[PDB]
Symmetry: C3
Subunit: 216 residues, 3 copies
């Protein structure tokens, strides 16, 4: 025969011709169909529904099934740059600080006192002839007759004591200035999830036929 019994035939109609059967995985009687049994010694006609025919390679058995499966491949990919913006730090408060204690000191001073001390002294007078010497006599006093000086006397000093007026009230400036800090951010990553793409089946362009087989 030009097309041997048992070879699958692609049939374009749901009306199956007399003498043929749909290939649907069914058993048959090997005694009743001796030529079909040459093609299928198991006595089972393969289920061809949803199947494509592939020429048997080395490493695969005849009538073995193979699932659909996508070929190994990957993808290039990239992530958008993200700007994290500006952040504000916690507040630090230096409060109020004290200075060291300093400023103990003395002053010096000099001057003149006021002018004072004007005075006179009393002198005992004596009279009566017979005795002379030493004492002031007032024997003859009718008219002025000039005058004269005591000897010198009266060198002296005084002590002084004082508290001063209150002074010295003051303040200072202190230049503090400006500063910055650094902040180490360190390292980080993210978890990447790639979503599914595709159909329930892997397919190529195909037209549907009913696989049939000649019984005898």
């Amino acid at each position: 025969s030009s097309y041997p019994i048992g070879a699958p035939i692609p049939w374009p109609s749901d009306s199956v011709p007399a003498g043929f059967a749909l290939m649907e995985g069914q058993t048959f009687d090997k005694s009743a169909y001796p030529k079909l049994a040459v093609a299928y010694p198991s006595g089972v006609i393969p289920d061809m529904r949803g199947q494509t025919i592939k020429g048997k390679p080395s490493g695969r058995a005849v009538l073995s099934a193979e699932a659909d499966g996508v070929k190994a491949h990957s993808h290039s990919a990239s992530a958008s740059s993200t700007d994290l913006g500006t952040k504000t730090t916690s507040s630090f408060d230096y409060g109020t600080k004290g200075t060291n204690s300093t400023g103990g000191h003395t002053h010096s001073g000099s001057g003149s006192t006021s002018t004072n001390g004007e005075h006179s002294h009393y002198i005992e007078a004596w009279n009566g002839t017979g005795v002379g010497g030493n004492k002031m006599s007032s024997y003859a006093i009718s008219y002025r007759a000039g005058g004269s000086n005591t000897n010198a006397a009266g060198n002296h000093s005084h002590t002084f004591s004082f508290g001063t007026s209150s002074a010295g009230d003051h303040s200072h400036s202190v230049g503090i200035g400006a500063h910055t800090h650094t902040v180490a951010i360190g390292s980080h990553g993210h978890t990447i999830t790639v979503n599914s793409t595709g159909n329930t089946e892997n397919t190529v362009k195909n037209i549907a036929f009913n696989y049939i087989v000649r019984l005898a």
Copy 2:
């Protein structure tokens, strides 16, 4: 027939033997070709170019077309870790600060004045007999005849007044010290783009034949 009319025949040449026709989508005459009309009641031969044959599953009509399509799948993916390094804060300027006002005080002093005040007194002298008593007589003064003292006098004080020398210029130190801050960085993501991989069509290893069909 061992291969019924209407079943597709894969043919290895571009020369189509007489009695057969290339399956190209063409309409045919159903009265001229009634056995072909049994297989193709619509009067149209399917266009098999670029097509593979698939056995018809439940849920698909005989001769329905199915496009090529990749099977549902995803990929695992990862993001490299990134070191953000070190960031500098803004500058804060404390400028110059002023202290409180303090340091009002007094001093005391004491001592002695210089020794001064030596002096003598003039005494009015009188002369001439007939009057006596009280006053100083200069009646007889030819030669020295001792001497004597006045009574005591002369107790007194003085006032004083002064400004002092300038003193008290000084400075202080002030311990400021060190500080840190904390800063909250927060959260972020990235937009992930995955590029296309693959061909115009989804294909399997295939050899090209011309599908032809027997007419009668």
Copy 3:
């Protein structure tokens, strides 16, 4: 002939019928197989092992081979949000600062001295008639005869100088206060790697048959 010589036949058995040959890429005797020579003018039967038949599309020669290949597709993807947390800045040390120099001043003061300076004076006495006037005579002094005063004298002042007691030790407070900074984080991204998914080959659901061909 209902299936012409040279058309490939899917055979379900490893035992090939007599008068057919596995399509394995072999050459053939063109004179001995003249109808086969019309189907295959090259004298070569194509290798059908691992092959699917596809209908010859335009732009492609009959019996040419086509490799398996995934259809162009991509995937959506996403990256998880990452909290970078709280970071501590570097420590900044203002250390110890100095103030400006100020505080130079004077004080005033006033008061009275102690009361001192009581004294008397010696007076020289003279005697002997023949000279008169001016000087103190002691001619006649037997009994007391009242007394009189010297003239006024003795106005004077003194100088003083001193160092004062120690005073003026003190300190100040200075309000510094609180501050924060801002910190610009800048931008970053990540290298994204997508891993391979799939099998050695692109496949659809298939059953393996031995492609054979009728010789004569």
